[PDB]
Design a protein around this motif. Structure first.
Motif, PDB file in Angstrom:
ATOM      1  N   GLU A 164       0.795  -1.241   0.000  1.00 30.87           N
ATOM      2  CA  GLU A 164       0.000   0.000   0.000  1.00 30.87           C
ATOM      3  C   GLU A 164       0.830   1.296   0.000  1.00 30.87           C
ATOM      4  O   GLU A 164       0.324   2.360  -0.354  1.00 30.87           O
ATOM      5  CB  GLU A 164      -0.963   0.024   1.188  1.00 30.87           C
ATOM      6  N   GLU A 165       2.092   1.211   0.402  1.00 34.46           N
ATOM      7  CA  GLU A 165       2.952   2.389   0.463  1.00 34.46           C
ATOM      8  C   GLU A 165       3.889   2.496  -0.728  1.00 34.46           C
ATOM      9  O   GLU A 165       4.626   3.468  -0.847  1.00 34.46           O
ATOM     10  CB  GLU A 165       3.740   2.408   1.764  1.00 34.46           C
ATOM     11  N   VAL A 166       3.843   1.496  -1.608  1.00 35.59           N
ATOM     12  CA  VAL A 166       4.604   1.511  -2.861  1.00 35.59           C
ATOM     13  C   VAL A 166       3.653   1.650  -4.065  1.00 35.59           C
ATOM     14  O   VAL A 166       3.885   2.469  -4.957  1.00 35.59           O
ATOM     15  CB  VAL A 166       5.499   0.247  -3.001  1.00 35.59           C
ATOM     16  N   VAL A 167       2.585   0.855  -4.071  1.00 41.74           N
ATOM     17  CA  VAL A 167       1.551   0.940  -5.096  1.00 41.74           C
ATOM     18  C   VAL A 167       0.249   1.433  -4.456  1.00 41.74           C
ATOM     19  O   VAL A 167      -0.338   0.728  -3.634  1.00 41.74           O
ATOM     20  CB  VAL A 167       1.321  -0.432  -5.779  1.00 41.74           C
ATOM     21  N   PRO A 168      -0.208   2.646  -4.825  1.00 39.28           N
ATOM     22  CA  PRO A 168      -1.421   3.170  -4.189  1.00 39.28           C
ATOM     23  C   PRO A 168      -2.629   2.268  -4.455  1.00 39.28           C
ATOM     24  O   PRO A 168      -2.731   1.686  -5.542  1.00 39.28           O
ATOM     25  CB  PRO A 168      -1.611   4.540  -4.855  1.00 39.28           C
ATOM     26  N   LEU A 169      -3.519   2.150  -3.467  1.00 36.00           N
ATOM     27  CA  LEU A 169      -4.734   1.333  -3.590  1.00 36.00           C
ATOM     28  C   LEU A 169      -5.475   1.536  -4.909  1.00 36.00           C
ATOM     29  O   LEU A 169      -5.804   0.559  -5.586  1.00 36.00           O
ATOM     30  CB  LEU A 169      -5.698   1.570  -2.416  1.00 36.00           C
ATOM     31  N   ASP A 170      -5.729   2.793  -5.275  1.00 38.76           N
ATOM     32  CA  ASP A 170      -6.506   3.094  -6.483  1.00 38.76           C
ATOM     33  C   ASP A 170      -5.837   2.585  -7.749  1.00 38.76           C
ATOM     34  O   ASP A 170      -6.517   2.228  -8.704  1.00 38.76           O
ATOM     35  CB  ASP A 170      -6.795   4.588  -6.602  1.00 38.76           C
ATOM     36  N   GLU A 171      -4.507   2.554  -7.741  1.00 37.94           N
ATOM     37  CA  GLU A 171      -3.740   2.005  -8.847  1.00 37.94           C
ATOM     38  C   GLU A 171      -3.820   0.478  -8.879  1.00 37.94           C
ATOM     39  O   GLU A 171      -3.958  -0.109  -9.951  1.00 37.94           O
ATOM     40  CB  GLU A 171      -2.289   2.477  -8.795  1.00 37.94           C
ATOM     41  N   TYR A 173      -6.366  -1.254  -7.740  1.00 39.74           N
ATOM     42  CA  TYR A 173      -7.735  -1.519  -8.197  1.00 39.74           C
ATOM     43  C   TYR A 173      -7.903  -1.350  -9.706  1.00 39.74           C
ATOM     44  O   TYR A 173      -8.540  -2.185 -10.351  1.00 39.74           O
ATOM     45  CB  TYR A 173      -8.765  -0.644  -7.459  1.00 39.74           C
ATOM     46  N   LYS A 174      -7.339  -0.274 -10.260  1.00 39.03           N
ATOM     47  CA  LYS A 174      -7.335  -0.075 -11.711  1.00 39.03           C
ATOM     48  C   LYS A 174      -6.633  -1.228 -12.417  1.00 39.03           C
ATOM     49  O   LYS A 174      -7.119  -1.720 -13.442  1.00 39.03           O
ATOM     50  CB  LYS A 174      -6.690   1.264 -12.103  1.00 39.03           C
ATOM     51  N   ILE A 175      -5.497  -1.659 -11.863  1.00 42.91           N
ATOM     52  CA  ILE A 175      -4.749  -2.784 -12.417  1.00 42.91           C
ATOM     53  C   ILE A 175      -5.596  -4.063 -12.400  1.00 42.91           C
ATOM     54  O   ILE A 175      -5.594  -4.831 -13.372  1.00 42.91           O
ATOM     55  CB  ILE A 175      -3.392  -2.996 -11.691  1.00 42.91           C
ATOM     56  N   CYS A 176      -6.324  -4.280 -11.309  1.00 43.72           N
ATOM     57  CA  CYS A 176      -7.158  -5.479 -11.175  1.00 43.72           C
ATOM     58  C   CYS A 176      -8.348  -5.466 -12.151  1.00 43.72           C
ATOM     59  O   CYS A 176      -8.794  -6.518 -12.606  1.00 43.72           O
ATOM     60  CB  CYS A 176      -7.637  -5.640  -9.731  1.00 43.72           C
ATOM     61  N   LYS A 177      -8.851  -4.272 -12.459  1.00 43.70           N
ATOM     62  CA  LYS A 177      -9.924  -4.107 -13.433  1.00 43.70           C
ATOM     63  C   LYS A 177      -9.433  -4.416 -14.844  1.00 43.70           C
ATOM     64  O   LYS A 177     -10.176  -4.972 -15.657  1.00 43.70           O
ATOM     65  CB  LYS A 177     -10.518  -2.699 -13.363  1.00 43.70           C
ATOM     66  N   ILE A 178      -8.184  -4.046 -15.127  1.00 46.91           N
ATOM     67  CA  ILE A 178      -7.532  -4.403 -16.391  1.00 46.91           C
ATOM     68  C   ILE A 178      -7.397  -5.928 -16.480  1.00 46.91           C
ATOM     69  O   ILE A 178      -7.814  -6.524 -17.467  1.00 46.91           O
ATOM     70  CB  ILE A 178      -6.166  -3.671 -16.581  1.00 46.91           C
ATOM     71  N   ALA A 179      -6.841  -6.542 -15.435  1.00 47.46           N
ATOM     72  CA  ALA A 179      -6.746  -8.003 -15.321  1.00 47.46           C
ATOM     73  C   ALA A 179      -8.103  -8.696 -15.490  1.00 47.46           C
ATOM     74  O   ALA A 179      -8.201  -9.760 -16.110  1.00 47.46           O
ATOM     75  CB  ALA A 179      -6.113  -8.394 -13.982  1.00 47.46           C
ATOM     76  N   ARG A 180      -9.148  -8.093 -14.925  1.00 45.54           N
ATOM     77  CA  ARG A 180     -10.509  -8.621 -15.051  1.00 45.54           C
ATOM     78  C   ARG A 180     -11.025  -8.627 -16.500  1.00 45.54           C
ATOM     79  O   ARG A 180     -11.725  -9.565 -16.900  1.00 45.54           O
ATOM     80  CB  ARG A 180     -11.477  -7.868 -14.129  1.00 45.54           C
TER      81      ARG A 180
END
Ligand SMILES: [Mn+2]
Ligand SMILES: [Mn+2]
Ligand SMILES: [Mn+2]
Length: 391
Positions: A164-171, A173-180
């Motif tokens: 969480e301190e290297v990759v922001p949560l919102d990023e 989540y966006k990444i997971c939506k791409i994966a989805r």
């Protein structure tokens, strides 16, 4: 309505012997309850026995009774896959041609390449692992490089862990939506993408409550959709809401264990509702079947059976109880995957004054959905044959 309330219990992965098409799946010889019964030197399940479990099939410690409490038979799966989504989606009136995939050797390079190309981040790991093992192994590298830890379990999931301190949560989540989006592809078809954020430092990593899931909606409107649309109650207990991505759910009760699951079933018995109460007892699958642990599985089955008499005591004359499973997961079988098996079906109401009888074998899991739909007078599903009138 013939029944005011229906309580549908999925004992997850509790299969009752290899299906006619078991060989296609490398599941010859599979027998969930039977192998467990043998390992236990006789399973102690006196209440399931009284309902007629042994009348479906006699197994060690599980004998037929002359006057079963309700009706009994088994169900054959018609859909292509043996995964959870397929089984539950079929139960609720669908037919699923395209199976969900599992990845014991990690995800294909083509998929990970495109995820990298789209996110601009490196992917590390790519194997089945628990949250703890993968973070201890790769959490530090993740922190230092900004790359994504991609992993899986024994089930159809793609998990993305990032600090969480290297990759922001919102990023994340966006990444997971791409994966989805990328995994809506039959080559790589994943049931669920899961964001696994974590905090801490090397040797002391903890996964945070900021987990988010990205599931697929069922491939069609279900009996649950129709119940909900006709102002019926649909009370999902345990992982039921997640499995259907909330479709047709009017209320959802979270559970932490099989015993907690039965407590919530009991809670719904105490509710004035009209419609469906739908429980999944997941421990059988998650803790015992996938871990090839017949002893743990046997104990869990006995712990579950011991809870049943309270349920029997709370059922009213216009309540129906349905007990089934969504596939097999034989704990004495190679690999970590599910097994293609028939599932038991028990159908009990206290209004059945002379006990039950054998039902014809259900040729699809959707016979349950069809029965539910006919009971409540909602639109019948495209698949499935109701046994309502047999009861
Ligand atoms: Mn197998
Ligand atoms: Mn399952
Ligand atoms: Mn599973």
């Amino acid at each position: 309505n013939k029944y005011k309330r229906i309580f549908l219990v999925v004992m997850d992965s509790v299969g009752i012997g290899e299906a006619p098409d078991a060989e296609q799946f490398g599941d010859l010889g599979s027998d969930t309850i039977g192998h467990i019964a043998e390992h236990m030197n006789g399973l102690q399940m006196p209440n399931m026995v009284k309902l007629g479990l042994g009348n479906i099939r006699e197994m060690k410690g599980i004998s037929k009774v002359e006057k079963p409490l309700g009706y009994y038979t088994k169900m054959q799966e018609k859909s292509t896959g043996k995964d959870t989504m397929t089984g539950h989606w079929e139960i609720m009136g669908l037919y699923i041609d395209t199976p969900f995939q599992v990845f014991p050797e990690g995800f294909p390079k083509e998929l990970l390449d495109e995820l990298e190309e789209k996110t601009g981040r490196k992917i590390i790991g790519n194997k089945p692992a628990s949250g703890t093992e993968i973070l201890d192994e790769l959490g530090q590298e993740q922190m230092e490089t900004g790359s994504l830890i991609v992993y899986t379990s024994a089930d159809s999931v793609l998990q993305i862990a990032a600090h969480e301190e290297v990759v922001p949560l919102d990023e994340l989540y966006k990444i997971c939506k791409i994966a989805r989006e990328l995994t809506l592809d039959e080559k790589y078809m994943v049931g669920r993408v899961i964001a696994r954020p974590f905090v801490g430092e090397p040797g002391n990593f903890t996964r945070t409550p900021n987990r988010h899931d990205y599931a697929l909606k069922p491939f069609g409107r279900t009996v649950m959709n129709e119940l909900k649309d006709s102002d019926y109650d649909v009370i999902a207990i345990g992982k039921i809401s997640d499995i259907y991505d909330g479709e047709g759910v009017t209320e959802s009760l979270r559970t932490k264990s099989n015993m907690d699951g039965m407590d919530k079933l009991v809670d719904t018995l105490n509710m004035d509702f009209t419609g469906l109460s739908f429980l999944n007892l997941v421990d059988f699958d998650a803790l015992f079947g996938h871990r090839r642990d017949p002893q743990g599985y046997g104990e869990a089955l006995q712990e579950y059976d011991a809870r049943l008499p309270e349920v029997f005591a709370k059922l009213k004359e216009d309540d129906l109880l349905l007990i089934t499973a969504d596939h097999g997961n034989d704990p004495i079988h190679p690999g970590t995957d599910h097994t293609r098996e028939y599932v038991p079906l028990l159908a009990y109401s206290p209004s059945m004054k002379e006990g039950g009888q054998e039902l014809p074998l259900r040729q699809t899991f959707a016979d349950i959905g069809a029965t539910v739909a006919e009971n409540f007078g909602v639109k019948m599903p495209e698949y499935g044959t109701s046994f309502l009138n047999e009861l």
